[PDB]
């Protein structure tokens, strides 16, 4: 029942229907250009939000609305090329999106010239967002309850494997990469400062009004209304939805998990989280 959803490779779970083992086996020797940009996330942590943000920053047609092209074609998923784009002929600087773990990266990323932006989010909101997204999307197995999906999640039996392993392998191996770390919650709290830090790390210059436009079009409620970024057509017509009521930009709030997890589930999660993360000095926000 569960083999047809996950493709395991070196202890990591790819989405089986979207990638083939040929491309996975080819990832190690993939040509990396010295100005490539990689958005690396664990699923449901702000991937397409960051796609939108980087598209607004790097493609002035998208920012000025002279071009009307979906953000997935600006920063396509490195391992999920659902639009069948020839990544080799895409113009530099290429932007890619990916959920792969540190040890599955193309060795060209270890030359530390291509840049990596790692976006993370508190794992309880990640859990609940993944729960709803799996209920909605056909490419994922349909979970029954919150308790059962939490078990499935802490077991790593989802696309992206175990959240703790993902974030740990990326952080505990910072120095193999030219990489920055930023949190969904920080982007939620100060969008403008986060955009500025992204531009600094990517050493991309922007005028002040351009940054105003980036913040304006990357805000949740405005981006949900932007069909170039809200992924509505992609999930309805290409990837397929079980119902037709849910959306990729569901709520986008921090702290919503408190309405789904009982105190017992939360405390068990906290024990696992402390065991896995007590040494990692990343700031974590859990509410508002
Ligand atoms: N501009 C934006 N601003 C704030 N939150 C956003 C956002 N775009 C997406 N989000 C939220 O990012 C989550 C999906 O992230 P990803 O792209 O990694 O799959 C969703 O969380 P929620 O399910 O809590 O709403 C989505 O609502
Ligand atoms: N975040 C994601 C993980 C795996 C597959 C996806 C497909 C489409 C959009 C987003 C995806």
Which is catalytic among the residues 62, 99, 132, 166?
A: 99
Contact 163, 281 (CB under 8 A): no
Q: How far apart are CA 55 and CA 223, in angstroms?
A: 12
Contact 11, 100 (CB under 8 A): no
Contact 41, 196 (CB under 8 A): no
Report which of 176, 177, 153 is spatially closest to residue 165, judged by C-alpha positions. 153
Contact 153, 9 (CB under 8 A): no
Resolution (A): 2.4
Q: Is 114 marked as a binding-site residue?
A: no
Contact 75, 97 (CB under 8 A): yes
**Residue 68 in tokens:** 């009307």
Q: Is the dihedral of CA 184, 185, 186, 192 positive or negative?
A: positive
Q: How far apart are CA 114 and CA 94, in angstroms?
A: 10
Q: Is 15 in the pocket of ligand 2 (CB under 6 A)?
A: yes
CA 133–ligand 2 middle distance (angstroms) = 10
Task: Cite the beta strand spans of the chain per DSSP E.
Answer: 6-9, 12-15, 37-41, 95-98, 115-120, 178-183
Q: How far apart are CA 187 and CA 229, in angstroms?
A: 17
Q: Using DSSP, state whether 15 is helix, strand or coil.
A: strand
* R_g (Cα) of the chain, nearest Å: 18
**Shortest-distance ligand to the CA of residue 159:** 2
Q: Is 12 in the pocket of ligand 1 (CB under 6 A)?
A: no
Query: Among 41, 139, 234, which is best to mutate for testing ligand 2, by the most ligand atoms less than 8 A from CB?
Result: 139
Q: Is 43 in the pocket of ligand 2 (CB under 6 A)?
A: yes
Residue ID of nearest Cα to ligand 2 atom 11: 43
Helix or strand holding residue 133 (H, E): helix 123-136
Q: How far apart are CA 163 and CA 282, in angstroms?
A: 14
Q: Is 88 marked as a binding-site residue?
A: no
Q: How far apart are CA 201 and CA 180, in angstroms?
A: 7
Cα torsion for 125, 127, 133, 136, to the nearest 10°?
A: -120
Report which of 16, 29, 9 is spatially closest to residue 105, judged by C-alpha positions. 29
Q: How many other CB atoms are found less than 10 A from the CB of residue 76?
A: 23
Residue 99 is among the residues annotated as catalytic for this protein: yes
Contact 227, 233 (CB under 8 A): yes
241: which DSSP letter? B
225: which DSSP letter? T
Q: How was this structure determined?
A: X-ray
To which residue do tokens 């002279």 refer?
A: 66
50: which DSSP letter? H
**Residue 84 in tokens:** 């069948």
């Amino acid at each position: 029942n569960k083999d047809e959803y996950l493709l395991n490779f070196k202890g990591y779970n790819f989405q089986k229907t979207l990638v083939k083992m040929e491309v996975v086996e080819n990832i190690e020797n993939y040509e990396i250009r010295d100005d490539d940009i990689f958005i690396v996330t664990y699923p449901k942590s702000g991937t397409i939000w960051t796609q939108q943000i980087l598209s607004l920053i790097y493609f002035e047609g998208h920012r000025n609305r002279t071009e009307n092209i979906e953000t997935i074609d600006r920063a396509p998923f490195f391992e999920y090329n659902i639009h069948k784009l020839d990544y080799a002929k895409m113009p530099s600087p290429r932007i890619f999106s990916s959920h792969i773990p540190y040890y599955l990266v193309p060795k060209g990323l270890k030359d530390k010239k291509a840049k990596i932006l790692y976006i993370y989010r508190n794992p309880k909101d990640v859990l609940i967002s993944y729960f709803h997204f799996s209920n909605l999307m056909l490419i994922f197995q349909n979970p029954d309850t919150v308790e059962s999906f939490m078990q499935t999640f802490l077991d790593g039996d989802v696309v992206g494997s175990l959240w703790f392993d993902h974030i740990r392998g990326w952080y505990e191996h910072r120095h193999d990469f030219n990489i920055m770390f930023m949190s969904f919650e920080d982007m939620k709290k100060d969008l403008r400062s986060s955009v500025l830090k992204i531009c600094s790390f990517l050493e991309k210059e922007l005028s002040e009004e351009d940054v105003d436009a980036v913040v304006r079009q990357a805000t949740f409620q405005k981006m949900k209304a932007d069909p170039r970024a809200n992924y509505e057509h992609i999930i309805k017509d290409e990837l397929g939805t079980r119902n037709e009521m849910g959306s990729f930009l569901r709520k986008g709030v921090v702290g919503a998990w408190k309405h789904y997890l009982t105190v017992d589930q939360s405390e068990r999660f906290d024990k696992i989280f402390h065991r896995n993360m007590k040494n990692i000095p990343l700031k974590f926000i859990w509410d508002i």
